Design a protein around this ligand. Structure first.
Ligand SMILES: CCCCCCCCCCCCCCCCCC(=O)OC[C@H](COP(=O)([O-])OCC(O)COP(=O)([O-])OC[C@@H](COC(=O)CCCCCCCCCCCCCCCCC)OC(=O)CCCCCCCCCCCCCCCCC)OC(=O)CCCCCCCCCCCCCCCCC
Ligand SMILES: CCCCCCCCCCCCCCCCCC(=O)OC[C@H](COP(=O)([O-])OCC(O)COP(=O)([O-])OC[C@@H](COC(=O)CCCCCCCCCCCCCCCCC)OC(=O)CCCCCCCCCCCCCCCCC)OC(=O)CCCCCCCCCCCCCCCCC
Ligand SMILES: CCCCCCCCCCCCCCCCCC(=O)OC[C@H](COP(=O)([O-])OCC(O)COP(=O)([O-])OC[C@@H](COC(=O)CCCCCCCCCCCCCCCCC)OC(=O)CCCCCCCCCCCCCCCCC)OC(=O)CCCCCCCCCCCCCCCCC
Ligand SMILES: CCCCCCCCCCCCCCCCC[C@@H](O)O[C@H](CO[C@H](O)CCCCCCCCCCCCCCC)COP(=O)(O)OCC[N+](C)(C)C
Ligand SMILES: CCCCCCCCCCCCCCCCC[C@@H](O)O[C@H](CO[C@H](O)CCCCCCCCCCCCCCC)COP(=O)(O)OCC[N+](C)(C)C
Ligand SMILES: CCCCCCCCCCCCCCCCC[C@@H](O)O[C@H](CO[C@H](O)CCCCCCCCCCCCCCC)COP(=O)(O)OCC[N+](C)(C)C
Ligand SMILES: CCCCCCCC/C=C\CCCCCCCC(=O)OC[C@H](COP(=O)(O)OCCN)OC(=O)CCCCCCC/C=C\CCCCCCCC
Ligand SMILES: CCCCCCCC/C=C\CCCCCCCC(=O)O[C@H](COC(=O)CCCCCCC/C=C/CCCCCCCC)COP(=O)(O)OCCN
Lengths: 105, 115, 175, 122, 71, 98, 347, 171, 83
């Protein structure tokens, strides 16, 4: 199956494009460079089976950065509770959350 | 936003022109006037019969040659890179391969229409 | 939620996909695929990928032209079928539209998971970056990196195109 | 699942690592090598049979080349097989030594203290 | 200078959102105000949903599509 | 996953289903194949742009190439069968059985 | 077709397979698949007739659909994890779609329908290529993602492939359809043990390849594509029919021939994972393949069918073209069992 | 998994630099030549800590230095500076090439009023060094302890005991 | 020597367009390897500061690195202004 000619000859035919933390042009970073770098450093050299259980925290953080599902859930809960507090009318959101703010540089 | 307004305005003006064309004049339509035109005599067959294409192979080649323009279009940005040797070599290689494709299609009588 | 632009464009994309997936006469299928390509191109520009959308739109407009040219020759169908001219085509079109509307309603009002995960709406604007830097286009730089990083990709793609020309000429030879 | 493809320190396309030189090479009178030579001889006989030639004596150089090539390939094949089995045994013994709690040495009773049920045959 | 002002602006928007969230979620059963989502404690760039989530629509449209729609 | 990702996945599923049902014409199935290609391109572009994967921006363009190489193939085949039957109906492809 | 063009098309097919098996990037594997299919299509249409053209159209449609779901599975895996390396497929839905796409690419049941038609529609050399070389890339891809493969789906498809091949091969009088159904059954046998041991998969594939090469090369030697056409070979070259019958015995899995070695090695492996029912069913189902090999052996070698008068003229001419590797393929397809432990060199 | 430390709104207070983009662009070269030191400390802090909350004071000092720069410009000669930056502001792309005479007048005013020298081409893009007393952070990524790797392969190689041990084979 | 000359004359007499295109392509292929200004182009591309130059931390033994932009140390763009 996998004949690792690239590793044998050090050719690097397609290893420059496998991850987002690997030498982007003009040093442009990915949205989750730190998370991917941390997970890769955690999981390096310990095998897939061990990395699936021991680097689960870093992978969970990386997936959270990638898809932001829990952040969307938190924001949805915040906005739903805000709407429920506004419908009956005892919130009165602040003026700087309505467009009457004095902006800074 | 601005481009959407432009497209909406253009489409709306064209549709308004169509509406004025189809609602202003007095129309008197009958069967003979709306019949198909074939220079005065009734058509023999239907205009929805197969119509042979003698340039079908050129049409197929046009798809790949159109993909090659998509490949070659980022060249102005590519010319700004540090590895000018590799960039120039790869661009020339792609153009040479497309030229060889054209030459092979030319020599094998592929650019000639069917009879 | 805001201006519904991305949502409306995605909905029209799905509608065009249903329109050419009901399989009417290939003229109308090509029309639906063209409108879907344009709508997807607009979707892509709404995320910052102007070049990719134009390129996709540009590639598709011409592919369809070749497809129209071939339909007028080999798929003529003296009574061409439109979406309302046949019971099967209209049934497929209405089924696709109804299924799309039900999915949109289920994923919009509530948080329903269909195959992969669920969705609560909020507009696609939420997942953006806030990154504020650059005197260049990141998408343009990434695409242009094909001629410095993607030497292998250029080699294999050019070889594939040359082989494709040879292959189509071999196939259409006949005899 | 693959058991030895991801072994640490493995050269991708070596087919014979340097550590394999620590193992005794197969003897040239190995029965497996003789079987490979027999396979080459049978290949030569079949080749003679297909081409409508005298089966036993058509080509002696062709048969000799067949046998020689089969033996030559079989030598390195046996070397690699022996090296792989030695690697398997080495890894197994190392794992057993490194995990004493999972392979406990159990004091074994004599048959005088064990009670086996007797089932008469009648 | 632009970097410093951007840092201050982002921190101010986050702090304003936090001070509000301390008010809307006073009476929710088990809400931890300002609780992070990631396990790690290092800085994470805001999502633009966390900076403009509790603001008017026209600021949201600006911050999302202003550069794309400016022609 | 917002509504856009789900809509693009639904478009791909619709195109795949339309391909898997054949009515009469081979050209319509080729159109469905082109639709699958367009949906894949759009989804990959959206995913790559969202995460700011700079290099991966060249990935969709390559995805387009082997698109028409697949299209140019099918059209080619569609010619030859037509030259045998004067029509592109998939009914005529019944010389070989199971 | 021009010999230079044929050679470059063959080398393009093999280069696509090589790119599939040497790439660590999913996009490169997809590109290799596309190249292999693109260069494979004209090889099936080398001889032009309506039947060959129909086979190429069906093959193109099937492989294109499989490629589309392959690409979508890659995109889904990228969406749920920003990874392009070929690895254990963090998302289960993408894994399922990839399994389905590779199943259609290999021809596992119930995606088996196109295999007999494509095999019957093309020549013997194209059939040999399709049934031997085209299986390397999908199996190489599967051997890399076996840790994430759902055992239920893969084993269901393997059992279905074995059953369907054994049942389909029973009703065939055309040799190419028999070969296709045998290929389906052997694909099931390969994929049955893949989630447990990929070394057994590689060994099974190698043995199947050598037996299929011997079979197809013997069928090319005696220009027969039907049972009755092959029934005339005893009156022209008996040795070809004798070697053919020995090869058919080997393919059926009868000891001590080589075809017994892979099955024996697979069942044993499946018994180390407390899998007893599945190997028993597979072994019992292989008897159908054995039966429709024995029917061919009865027709061609163990009995003498009536011949024709003109055959006498063929007695005055020899097979001008020689295949050098045929005796080696026959020997490797029959007399290899005593060298079974050498499979340790495959891991 | 923890509450996020955010500074109070009083810690984010600073005297803002309220000049427009054109005004900043007109004096950009002299600003980078004169206020290079606090800017370089702030940038080094920003890139080393990777946290906007750990380098607020450096930003305040950057703002203060910019304020001193603009105050000196206002005090010594502001009329040529205004004539230059109005011209810079006119252009839609804010092109330096459109107004070289106003730039020349401003440069000649600052050369003899304050001794300022406009940097040459390529000097402002140089990579410079920073002397700082801020300790170098040890774990800016807040990394956890890395898992211990698989132990090793050690010892010599011996032939397999009783060969392959596969079924009846004795080798 | 002579066969190529007659072939080129015949090609110019019958297909001038192909002769011109092949000559232009050959020149475009060959000339860049024999030009001294390719290095200048590479250096100009290298001298464009797209992103911010992050300053280094002084460990006390960096003579080559400058401390202020107008110090003589560091790269110089003098060759670009005179080109
Ligand atoms: C030429 C004469 C010559 O010089 O030969 C020297 C050579 C000297 O060998 P040796 O090391 O001194 O003594 C070997 C003994 O047999 C001592 O026996 P052993 O322990 O070395 O056995 C060798 C071993 C490994 O050797 C083999 O696997 C190959 C042996 C031939 C198998 C027979 C199949 C067809 C005949 O074979 C086995 O493990 C026993 C099972 C073999 C059955 C193979 C499975 C097929 C089933 C039936 C079909 O003699 C032979 O090779 C015997 C002739 C063959
Ligand atoms: C786990 C370890 C084990 C590994 C196992 C691996 C797999 C095992 C085997 C797999 C199954 C084998 C199936 C192969 C069957 C081949 C199909 C076929 O051609 O027809 C069947 C063939 C047809 O029989 P026929 O009816 O007599 O032929 C009538 C004519 O074909 C009628 O046609 P014609 O009139 O047109 O005649 C033209 C004829 C005569 O040809 C000529 O006229 C010669 C003139 C040359 C023209 C120059 C053109 C070149 C310029 C173009 C450049 C293109 C570059 C492409 C690269 C692009 C890169 C992006 O050409 C041919 O017949 C075919 C040419 C074959 C050339 C093959 C070259 C190898 C390509 C390798 C590519 C890979 C490179 C690396 C890629 C890197 C990644 C990117 O029958 C046989 O050949 C007998 C079967 C023998 C097969 C081999 C047996 C097994 C292999 C044992 C060898 C050792 C293996 C292990 C090696 C490990 C490393 C040392
Ligand atoms: C664990 C077991 C251990 C031992 C293993 C034993 C098994 C066999 C041996 C291994 C494999 C050998 C295969 C190569 C031989 C193939 C050649 C051939 O085709 O035969 C024709 C050929 C006769 O032709 P000819 O004499 O030139 O002139 C007559 C014309 O050719 C006139 O010819 P024709 O073509 O006109 O005649 C027509 C005839 C011609 O048809 C044939 O030739 C049949 C050939 C059989 C195909 C072999 C397939 C590959 C082997 C697989 C074996 C599987 C083993 C598992 C057990 C199951 C058995 C199937 O066809 C028929 O009559 C149709 C009848 C249908 C019967 C179906 C059954 C056939 C398959 C049975 C295979 C069993 C082996 C056969 C015996 C050997 C031959 O036979 C031979 O002469 C060669 C036989 C072996 C040569 C022995 C030389 C050794 C010299 C002594 C050295 C001393 C050693 C010790 C040194 C120290 C001493 C002082
Ligand atoms: C240059 C681009 C921009 C142009 C900007 C101006 C837009 C132009 C307006 C759009 C097209 C107008 C065309 C001008 C001709 C009028 C056509 C139509 O409006 O009249 C009739 C439409 O009326 C219908 O007959 C029905 C009338 C009543 C039924 C429903 C109307 C309900 C509205 C309530 C009206 C009561 C008074 C309202 C006071 C505000 C159609 O009669 P028909 O013969 O077929 O068509 C041929 C018209 N002919 C006779 C002139 C040749
Ligand atoms: C060893 C096998 C030899 C025989 C087999 C041949 C089959 C393979 C096809 C050709 C193999 C050559 C490909 C080698 C990989 C290319 C990548 C590597 O060599 O470096 C590139 C070197 O490429 C150069 O341009 C020279 C090699 C290109 C050769 C031109 C194409 C010829 C291919 C012809 C065969 C292909 C099929 C047929 C097409 C006609 C660029 O590297 P570099 O720029 O330093 O640094 C990149 C990293 N950065 C961006 C961070 C700076
Ligand atoms: C019918 C029996 C099968 C016939 C086999 C074909 C006969 C010819 C032999 C093929 C010649 C090539 C072999 C050696 C050339 C170079 C080898 C090297 O380059 O490759 C090594 C690999 O070599 C192969 O593993 C060994 C091939 C030897 C084939 C013989 C074994 C057959 C099984 C037992 C049947 C008995 C056969 C007896 C012959 C008569 C690198 O290992 P690796 O890259 O890490 O493995 C890749 C796959 N992984 C990672 C998934 C594991
Ligand atoms: C793009 C550049 C040009 C854009 C178009 C602008 C056009 C401006 C000029 C319009 C002229 C006014 C209308 C003239 C066309 C009317 C057609 C006509 O002749 O109809 C006559 C018809 C006779 O019918 P009957 O006597 O009942 O019996 C006949 C059946 N046997 O009489 C009518 O109905 C005409 C009614 C008046 C039409 C309304 C005119 C209003 C002014 C034009 C508005 C333009 C809108 C744009
Ligand atoms: C080293 C650089 C190479 C790469 C750059 C190439 C750039 C791209 C240009 C080529 C594109 C494709 C070319 C396709 C080739 C056409 C083949 C062909 O068939 O041409 C024949 C004609 O035959 C030819 O091939 C043309 C003549 C030979 C080729 C042209 C000249 C070759 C090169 C000459 C220039 C050398 C360099 C300049 C030297 C200057 C003098 C010292 C066409 O005739 P018909 O259409 O059949 O006529 C039917 C009606 N009567």
């Amino acid at each position: 199956p996998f004949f690792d000619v690239q590793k044998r000859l050090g050719l690097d035919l397609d290893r420059w494009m496998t991850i987002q933390s690997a030498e982007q042009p003009h040093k442009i970073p990915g949205r989750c460079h730190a998370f991917e770098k941390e997970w890769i450093e955690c999981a390096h050299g310990i095998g897939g089976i061990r990395a699936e259980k021991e680097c689960k925290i870093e992978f969970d953080d990386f997936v959270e950065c990638l898809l932001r599902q829990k952040t969307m859930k938190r924001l949805s809960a915040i906005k739903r509770q805000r709407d429920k507090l506004i419908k009956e009318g005892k919130y009165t959101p602040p003026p700087h959350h309505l467009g009457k703010e004095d902006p800074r540089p | 936003m601005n481009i959407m307004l432009t497209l909406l305005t253009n489409v709306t003006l064209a549709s308004l022109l169509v509406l004025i064309a189809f609602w202003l004049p007095q129309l008197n339509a009958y069967s003979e006037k709306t019949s198909p035109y074939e220079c005065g005599f009734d058509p023999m067959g239907s205009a929805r019969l197969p119509f042979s294409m003698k340039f079908f192979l050129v049409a197929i080649t046009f798809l790949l040659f159109d993909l090659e323009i998509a490949l070659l279009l980022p060249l102005p940005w590519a010319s700004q890179t540090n590895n000018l040797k590799t960039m120039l070599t790869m661009a020339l290689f792609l153009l040479i391969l497309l030229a060889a494709s054209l030459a092979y299609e030319w020599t094998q009588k592929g650019l000639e229409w069917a009879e | 939620m805001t201006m519904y632009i991305a949502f409306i464009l995605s909905t029209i994309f799905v509608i065009g996909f249903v329109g050419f997936s009901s399989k009417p006469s290939p003229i109308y299928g090509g029309l639906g695929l063209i409108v879907s390509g344009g709508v997807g191109c607009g979707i892509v520009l709404n995320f910052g990928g102007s070049f990719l959308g134009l390129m996709v739109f540009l590639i598709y407009l011409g592919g369809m032209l070749v497809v129209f040219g071939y339909t007028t020759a080999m798929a003529t169908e003296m009574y061409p079928e439109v979406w309302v001219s046949n019971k099967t085509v209209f049934g497929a079109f209405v089924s696709g539209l109804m299924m799309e509307f039900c999915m949109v309603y289920y994923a919009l009002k509530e948080e329903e998971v269909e195959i992969i995960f669920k969705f609560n709406g909020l507009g696609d604007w939420v997942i953006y970056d806030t990154g504020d830097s650059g005197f260049f286009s990141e998408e343009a730089m990434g695409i242009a990196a094909l001629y410095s990083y993607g030497t292998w990709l250029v080699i294999v793609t050019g070889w594939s195109l040359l082989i494709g020309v040879v292959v189509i000429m071999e196939i259409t030879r006949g005899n | 699942m693959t058991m030895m493809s991801g072994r640490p320190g493995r050269v991708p396309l070596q087919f014979l690592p340097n550590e394999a030189r620590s193992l005794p090479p197969p003897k040239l009178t190995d029965p497996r090598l003789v079987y490979m030579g027999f396979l080459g001889y049978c290949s030569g006989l079949i080749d003679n049979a297909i081409r409508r030639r005298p089966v036993v004596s058509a080509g002696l150089h062709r048969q000799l080349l067949y046998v020689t090539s089969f033996v030559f390939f079989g030598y390195y094949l046996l070397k690699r097989q022996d090296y792989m089995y030695a690697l398997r045994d080495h890894d197994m013994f190392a794992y057993v030594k490194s995990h004493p709690e999972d392979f406990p040495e159990k004091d074994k009773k004599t048959y005088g203290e064990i009670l086996e049920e007797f089932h008469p045959v009648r | 200078l632009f970097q410093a002002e951007k840092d201050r602006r982002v921190l101010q928007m986050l702090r304003e959102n936090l001070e509000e969230e301390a008010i809307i979620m006073k009476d929710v059963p088990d809400w931890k105000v300002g609780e992070s989502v990631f396990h790690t404690t290092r800085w994470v760039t805001p999502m633009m949903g966390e900076l403009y989530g509790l603001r008017t629509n026209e600021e949201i449209l600006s911050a999302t599509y202003g550069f794309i729609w400016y022609t | 996953m917002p509504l856009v990702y789900m809509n693009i996945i639904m478009a791909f599923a619709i195109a795949l289903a339309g391909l898997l049902m054949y009515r009469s014409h081979l050209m319509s199935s080729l159109l469905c194949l082109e639709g699958m290609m367009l949906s894949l391109f759009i989804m990959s572009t959206l995913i790559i742009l969202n995460t700011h994967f700079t290099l991966a921006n060249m990935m969709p363009i390559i995805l387009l190439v082997f698109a028409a190489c697949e299209a140019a193939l099918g059209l080619s085949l569609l010619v030859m069968v037509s030259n045998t039957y004067g029509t592109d109906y998939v009914q005529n492809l019944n010389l070989l059985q199971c | 077709m021009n010999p230079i063009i044929y050679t470059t098309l063959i080398m393009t097919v093999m280069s696509g397979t090589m790119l599939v098996m040497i790439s660590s990037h999913w996009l490169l594997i997809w590109i290799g698949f596309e190249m292999n299919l693109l260069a494979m299509i004209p090889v099936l249409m080398k001889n032009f007739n309506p039947r060959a053209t129909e086979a190429a159209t069906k093959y193109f449609l099937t492989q294109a659909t499989a490629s589309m779901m392959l690409m979508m599975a890659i995109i889904i895996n990228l969406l749920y994890s920003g990874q392009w390396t070929i690895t254990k497929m963090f998302n289960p839905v993408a894994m399922t779609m990839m399994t389905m796409a590779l199943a259609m690419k290999l021809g596992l049941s119930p995606f088996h329908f196109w295999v007999p038609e494509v095999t019957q529609g093309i020549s013997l050399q194209a059939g040999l290529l399709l049934l031997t070389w085209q299986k390397l890339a999908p199996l190489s891809v599967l051997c890399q993602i076996s840790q994430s493969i759902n055992p239920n789906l893969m084993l269901t498809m393997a059992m279905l492939s074995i059953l369907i091949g054994g049942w389909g091969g029973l009703n065939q009088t055309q040799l190419r359809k028999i070969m296709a159904y045998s290929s389906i059954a052997h694909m099931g046998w390969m994929t049955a043990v893949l989630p447990y041991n990929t070394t057994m998969t590689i060994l099974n594939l190698l043995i199947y390849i050598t037996m299929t090469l011997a079979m197809f090369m013997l069928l090319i030697h005696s220009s027969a594509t039907t049972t009755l056409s092959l029934s005339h070979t005893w009156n022209k070259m008996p040795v070809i029919t004798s070697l053919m019958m020995v090869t058919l015995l080997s393919m059926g899995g009868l000891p001590p021939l080589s075809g017994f070695m892979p099955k024996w090695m697979i069942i044993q492996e499946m018994t180390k994972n407390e899998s007893i029912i599945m190997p028993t069913l597979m072994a019992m189902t292989a008897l159908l393949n054995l039966y429709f090999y024995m029917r061919l052996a009865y027709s061609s070698s163990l009995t003498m069918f009536p011949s024709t008068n003109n055959m006498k003229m063929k007695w005055q001419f020899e097979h001008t073209k020689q295949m050098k590797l045929l005796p080696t393929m026959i020997v490797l397809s029959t007399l290899v069992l005593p060298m079974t432990p050498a499979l340790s060199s495959l891991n | 998994p923890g509450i996020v430390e955010l500074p109070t709104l009083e810690d984010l207070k600073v005297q803002e630099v309220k000049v427009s983009s054109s005004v900043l662009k007109a004096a950009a070269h002299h600003y980078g030549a004169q206020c290079d030191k606090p800017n370089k400390e702030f940038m080094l802090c920003r890139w080393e800590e990777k946290d906007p909350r750990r380098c607020l004071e450096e930003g305040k000092l950057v703002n203060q230095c910019a304020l001193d720069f603009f105050r000196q410009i206002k005090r010594h000669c502001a009329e040529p500076f205004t004539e230059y930056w109005t011209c810079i502001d006119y252009s839609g792309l804010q092109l330096f090439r459109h107004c070289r005479k106003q730039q020349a007048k401003f440069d000649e005013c600052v050369l003899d009023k304050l001794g300022w020298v406009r940097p040459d081409l390529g000097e402002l893009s140089k990579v410079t060094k920073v002397k700082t007393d801020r300790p170098l952070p040890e774990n800016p990524y807040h990394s956890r302890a890395r898992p211990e790797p698989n132990p090793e392969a050690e010892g010599d190689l011996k032939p397999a005991k009783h060969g392959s041990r596969l079924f009846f084979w004795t080798m | 020597a002579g066969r190529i000359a007659s072939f080129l004359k015949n090609a110019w007499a019958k297909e001038p367009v192909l002769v011109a295109s092949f000559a232009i392509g050959g020149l475009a292929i060959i000339l860049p390897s024999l030009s001294p200004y390719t290095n200048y182009a590479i250096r100009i591309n290298r001298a464009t500061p797209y992103n911010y130059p992050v300053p280094l931390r002084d460990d006390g033994n960096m003579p080559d690195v400058p401390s202020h932009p107008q110090d003589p140390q560091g790269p110089s763009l003098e060759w670009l202004k005179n080109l």
